[PDB]
């Protein structure tokens, strides 16, 4: 519902979505063979499925191909200072892909706008939607469209005849935030195939024991997971598959 979306939000009015109460894997996302921007700092793709955070956010805004690099925190420009500001200690990265098929018609696609004029530096993780008339002269502007009074929002020309660097790219940015609260969303763990009748070790949610796995004839009550004996040693464990 975020990637394969029917419509895409504007640059200034980027949609924010929070996902939780589930698990999220990045292996299928990596092997899609359609994303040309996956440079990430701080975390690693190999260790992304091991550690996790309290919550994961998602941001949706479509830009050109020249501004996908501008989303890095150490960047300046009309997008990196007036549209989206990323902190230096930001955890996560930016996912972008080519969207030549969509977000374009026969004529100029003027359905997307972005901020162009601002009197102050934007705060990190802040979105501004202002429809006030921008002023540059000393005389105040009472909402008129005269000299030194222009709309801050500038239209984007998403023509199909533009170059690769000017092609509109659909950009989805994930946000990783870890707090002291217990984690609600994490990564799914591995599920290796069991090996019976062989001296193997396992991690069955409560122990790390080495031994063969033999089929038994005693059945468990449907509320127990462990199993003891006379000598108080674990020798009967239920496989949750």
């Amino acid at each position: 519902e975020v990637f394969n979306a029917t419509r895409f939000a504007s640059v200034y009015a980027w949609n924010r979505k929070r996902i939780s109460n589930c698990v999220a894997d990045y292996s299928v996302l990596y092997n899609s063979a359609s994303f040309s921007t996956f440079k990430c700092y701080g975390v690693s793709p190999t260790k992304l499925n091991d550690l996790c955070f309290t919550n994961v956010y998602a941001d949706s805004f479509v830009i050109r191909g020249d501004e996908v690099r501008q989303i890095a925190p150490g960047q300046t420009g009309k997008i990196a200072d007036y549209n989206y500001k990323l902190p230096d200690d930001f955890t996560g990265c930016v996912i972008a892909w080519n969207s030549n098929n969509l977000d374009s018609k026969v004529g100029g696609n003027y359905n997307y706008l972005y901020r162009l004029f601002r009197k102050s530096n934007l705060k990190p993780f802040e979105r501004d939607i202002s429809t006030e008339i921008y002023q540059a002269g000393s005389t105040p502007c009472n909402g008129v469209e005269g000299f030194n009074c222009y709309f801050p929002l500038q239209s984007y020309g998403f023509q199909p005849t533009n170059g690769v660097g000017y092609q509109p790219y659909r950009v989805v940015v994930l946000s990783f935030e870890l707090l002291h609260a217990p984690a609600t969303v994490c990564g799914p763990k591995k599920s290796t195939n069991l090996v019976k009748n062989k001296c193997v070790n396992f991690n069955f949610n409560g122990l790390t024991g080495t031994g063969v796995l033999t089929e038994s004839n005693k059945k468990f009550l449907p509320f127990q997971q462990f199993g003891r004996d006379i000598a108080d040693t674990t020798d009967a464990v239920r496989d949750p598959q």
Epitope: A13, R16, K17, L113, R127, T131, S155
Partner: antibody
Amino acid sequence: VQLVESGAEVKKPGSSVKVSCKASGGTFSSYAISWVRQAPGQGLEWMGGIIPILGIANYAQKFQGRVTITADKSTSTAYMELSSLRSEDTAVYYCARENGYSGYGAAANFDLWGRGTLVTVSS
Amino acid sequence: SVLTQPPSVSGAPGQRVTISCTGSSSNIGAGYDVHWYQQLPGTAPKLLIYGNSNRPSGVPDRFSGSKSGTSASLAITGLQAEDEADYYCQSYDSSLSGSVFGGGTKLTVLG
């Protein structure tokens, strides 16, 4: 300023309803213009909004490509068009004016409201 | 819709009535704030509160709201005869890519 709309209108189930929302005491300035309907016994739905200073529109996902909304900067009026009328569409419409701000929230709040247009369908 | 509101509420002229508007995490639980609107039965709806902390001109000081987690709450200092009106909560929806209103509640104080 205050905004004025059209009067009561009655039509056929399958015609096109045409309404407008005019501005008195001033133009729309640079603030966006949106329309919000209200049905008896139900909530208020949002169908789309118009940028009067750029002449562009942003619709909603619930409403498909049957409604075109435009704005004219010469007369400072809101132009609304709806087609393929249905017996369900017995709601009244108001023209909303949004006043944004800079902050963490960035949620559009409707500042000014129109008088309201009564539209009903009868075979 | 995606926003859930109580169907009706009751109160007395002199007590405190709290109305809570809860929704999904995409709109209410995200970074967007909430906006309250009051619609009397016979007049056009009007703005009441934006930004969850500020108040407009002409709005009495008895109208105060608070935001806590994935819900929005309101504090009312006494109910008057003119308070008999529908109450709605509006917030920006990321999945819908547009504004969505609440289910609506009825505050009837009469005898």
